Design a protein around this ligand. Structure first.
Ligand code: ZN
Length: 33
DNA sequence: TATGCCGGGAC
DNA sequence: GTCCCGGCATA
């Protein structure tokens, strides 16, 4: 929904700024839900 | 079109 | 251990 986890924050042009769960398309370890 | 995730795949 | 996508649930 209206949430903003790593990928919707930084985008694929800044993928290096995401958490390692987001890097691997697994449940976010940073922006908990 | 695209986030966000499990099941499956790579080395 | 460290690395990621295909297909799906979902909007
Ligand atoms: Zn994350």
């Amino acid at each position: 929904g209206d949430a903003k986890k790593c990928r919707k924050v930084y985008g694929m042009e800044r993928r290096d700024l995401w958490c390692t769960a987001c890097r691997w398309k697994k449940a976010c370890q940073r922006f908990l839900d």
